[model samples]
Target: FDPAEKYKMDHRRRGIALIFNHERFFWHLTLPERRGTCADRDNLTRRFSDLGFEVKCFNDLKVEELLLKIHEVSTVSHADADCFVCVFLSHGEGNHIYAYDAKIEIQTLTGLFKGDKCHSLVGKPKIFIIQAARGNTNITEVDAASVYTLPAGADFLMCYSVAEGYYSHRETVNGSWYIQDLCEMLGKYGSSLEFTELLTLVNRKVSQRRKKQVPCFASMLTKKLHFFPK
Candidate 1:
């Protein structure tokens, strides 16, 4: 139970990296197209792959297809993997992220990997990175979930592009400010520093922007995490 202890990152593979990239929505949804998400997805694909993850990207899936895809992955055994990572890029409200056609609850996506649901990932880190636009006021704002008073599950790390009640910024050509910083830190210190330590740097870097977006994370991890070389 000592927080100083580190998560075991010595498995054969770092683990699976699932990126859900949502750009265009259905005609009925009235959601604006998200440009530049490709850049964010590509950067993460390269970064996590370099860190030894089996990266898989999913693009513009409908609600049923999205649920089925995640369900399939959750059932698979991860005995030889060190951890799991999932990312969402889309427009959303406070507690739900939008798929191509409908909005999906954040819990619905993350619940599949809970200890009781996905036994294969028990005791290992299940990290989720979400970038969604919560409002239409800002030209390129990312979305966020409501404040987490307590972590819903153990061994999970939820990283949000921006805090609730604020707009998350992105660029048409570059990427979201938070992700751009996160991938940078991951590349620079992922194999060297503890995971949360690197996230602190991300918080710092993103907060200094002229737009003033502050990224946040909720952690239920029992120990330090490092993406050190396997």
Candidate 2:
């Protein structure tokens, strides 16, 4: 059966908060410094806002600041949102994302929003779209015979720009391929396509456009999900 067809909307009202971090101060790299990430950040914010989400954005934040912002958004402080989306664009080491001040393991940051901790988002889809390198070398030509297993969960999706131990790339002028494809796919099919379909499109685009780099996806979602407001 089609995974997309397996799940239906519960009719519960949902809201999404998209978090994009683009600036990095730790490494003197040309990609983050020259190819300003504000455009991608703005695009995602606008896209989610158009979809009627109570969207919020943060730029060039330190590790502590970003974590605090995430906690603020993930919790049910003012309004009740059914789901959350977090995107990170920065230079990353394996298993961790770098903040302006330091690096925090991705798991540490994301674990805070787990069902037990952030009850507000329990049983709701939590999408994490990450645009960072998993390693230091270019991986456009790596073999594709490897497979990795993910843990079991029904509420989380972790999308990486490249496979493990491989480097992900971005154009010196244009942004990373994953973000570009993601925005394009979401804009075109956000309301119409199921979540997996959207992700499949992302996989196809990244694989076709990039020669050395490919995007990777991991999910622990218990069931399928949708992104529409209603």
Candidate 3:
């Protein structure tokens, strides 16, 4: 069996999708405009469900609580399932994203899925998608550069909404441009496309329509794996 295609469980069963959505801007945030998301969370939740991932949302988490939830979930066995997915949506600045009351280093979040830390997921795919919405700033910004710089775990993929030193855009009603395109691409082409392949289409679409925003993925995926939601 191809390593990338193999899972702890059968593809016919359910997989897990964990999302951390931070709405209340904390850490004494001063942005009058950048508050929280409305449609992005539900939009993501619905789309992943269509892809057959048993999605769960962790809302308005503090830095400590966020890490705890990740560690707790990562420790569980993914029996008779496919791959795992984790998503993050929150206010960000500098090299970190905001929890309800603090700024959390990105590494602190991704490290939980390390081969040694989360053994059930050692050889399996760990796909983490981050839709970090940074406070408005004119300077160059990237929501997840730390994710890319982190060492690639075995069979891992890190997908980001914006590239390094650049900004991402979101609409009050439609959500972020990146997320809008991502959900659209998945809904339209998920059954026929591999995970990475689908994200590529998302990146292309986002880059074309939004200014200075580019979605990206870093991976060590070993096989030509595709979602079989059908």
Ranking by lDDT: 1, 3, 2
Model 3 scores what on Cα lDDT?
0.72
lDDT tens per residue, model 2, 1-230: 55544333443545656665656575653333525355567677777776666667777788788877777665654235656777776666646666776777877777877766777677677778777653222212222212221322467888776775444555544556667788788888888777777888888888786345567778787676666656
What clash count goes with each model? Answer: 4, 6, 5
TM-score of each: 0.93, 0.79, 0.84
- Can you write out model 3's per-residue Cα lDDT over 34-56, one digit (the tens) per residue? 33255778898998999888899
Model 1: C-alpha RMSD to truth? 2.6
Cα miss at 171, model 3 (Å)?
0.2
Instruction: Give the per-residue lDDT digits (tens) of candidate 1, residues 101-202.
Output: 999888877989998888889999999988876545334545433433224589999888878556687877787888899999998998999888999999
Error of model 3, residue 226, in angstroms: 0.7
Which candidate achieves the best lDDT against the true structure? 1
Global lDDT scores for all candidate models? 0.85, 0.64, 0.72
